[PDB]
Structure formats: structure tokens, C-alpha cells
Design a protein around this motif. Sequence first.
Motif, PDB file in Angstrom:
ATOM      1  N   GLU A  58       1.014  -1.128  -0.138  1.00  0.00           N
ATOM      2  CA  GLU A  58       0.098   0.199  -0.145  1.00  0.00           C
ATOM      3  C   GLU A  58       0.635   1.257   0.561  1.00  0.00           C
ATOM      4  O   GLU A  58       0.539   2.112   0.054  1.00  0.00           O
ATOM      5  CB  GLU A  58      -0.813  -0.135   1.194  1.00  0.00           C
ATOM      6  N   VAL A  59       1.991   1.104   0.004  1.00  0.00           N
ATOM      7  CA  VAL A  59       3.198   2.203   0.234  1.00  0.00           C
ATOM      8  C   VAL A  59       3.511   2.055  -1.278  1.00  0.00           C
ATOM      9  O   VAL A  59       3.620   3.585  -1.371  1.00  0.00           O
ATOM     10  CB  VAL A  59       4.205   2.395   0.833  1.00  0.00           C
ATOM     11  N   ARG A  60       3.876   1.134  -1.693  1.00  0.00           N
ATOM     12  CA  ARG A  60       4.749   1.072  -3.289  1.00  0.00           C
ATOM     13  C   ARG A  60       3.939   1.285  -3.678  1.00  0.00           C
ATOM     14  O   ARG A  60       4.041   2.239  -4.798  1.00  0.00           O
ATOM     15  CB  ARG A  60       5.038  -0.263  -3.337  1.00  0.00           C
ATOM     16  N   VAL A  61       2.930   0.963  -3.946  1.00  0.00           N
ATOM     17  CA  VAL A  61       1.543   1.456  -4.613  1.00  0.00           C
ATOM     18  C   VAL A  61       0.158   1.392  -4.381  1.00  0.00           C
ATOM     19  O   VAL A  61       0.045   1.408  -3.765  1.00  0.00           O
ATOM     20  CB  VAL A  61       1.267   0.088  -5.742  1.00  0.00           C
ATOM     21  N   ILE A  62       0.215   3.564  -4.296  1.00  0.00           N
ATOM     22  CA  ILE A  62      -0.482   4.359  -3.575  1.00  0.00           C
ATOM     23  C   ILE A  62      -1.358   4.121  -4.616  1.00  0.00           C
ATOM     24  O   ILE A  62      -2.503   4.410  -5.276  1.00  0.00           O
ATOM     25  CB  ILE A  62      -0.138   5.440  -3.533  1.00  0.00           C
ATOM     26  N   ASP A  63      -2.074   3.091  -3.424  1.00  0.00           N
ATOM     27  CA  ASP A  63      -4.860   3.320  -3.849  1.00  0.00           C
ATOM     28  C   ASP A  63      -5.164   4.417  -3.216  1.00  0.00           C
ATOM     29  O   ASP A  63      -5.672   4.332  -2.225  1.00  0.00           O
ATOM     30  CB  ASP A  63      -4.303   1.129  -3.738  1.00  0.00           C
TER      31      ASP A  63
END
Lengths: 50, 50
Positions: A9-14
Amino acid sequence: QAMDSYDPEVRVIDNVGVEDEMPNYCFPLSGVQIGNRSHEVQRNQQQWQN
Amino acid sequence: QAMDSYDPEVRVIDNVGVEDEMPNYCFPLSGVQIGNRSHEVQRNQQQWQN
């Protein structure tokens, strides 16, 4: 044996949003606000007296 | 391919409670609030003077 791992959830900000449909309304320490005092008044015959 | 999910904490809401025990409190940006000023007073003679 501790794998270096990133939070997905930090590497790929959704950015799904924040989900704030209701206010929060922080209220003072004790119910009503303590300000100017008030006088209890009754009705004697025609006018309101303290 | 995406499981149509339903968030089992939403279909069956379990009111375990609100978990609150501690007051939270919000404080003004300046710590102590800025209000009426005060005068430094020192005891030179018997009475107090500014």
C-alpha cells in the motif's frame, strides 16, 4: 531470515479516498461553554423580576 | 479475475465496542492559551508593587 519487505500500500499508492461522510466535532472539556452567568427570573404579577 | 468481496466486518457488524477508555484532548497551538497579560511583582517593602 527476515526478508526485506516493502508495504504494498506504500509502493503502490491506492488513493481510494478517506471515507469521511460524518463530522467529528471535538467538544469542550465540560459540555456547555462556561461564559457569562445568567439570572433566574420569575413572573411576579405582570413583569419578569429577578 | 477479481473476487467480488463483501468485507465480512460489514455484512455482520460486530459491536465489540468503541474501545475508548482514555480522554483524547486537543490543545491550542501555543500550549498555554494567550489571554490577559500579567505584571511581575516583587516584594521590596511590606506590600507588593509591580
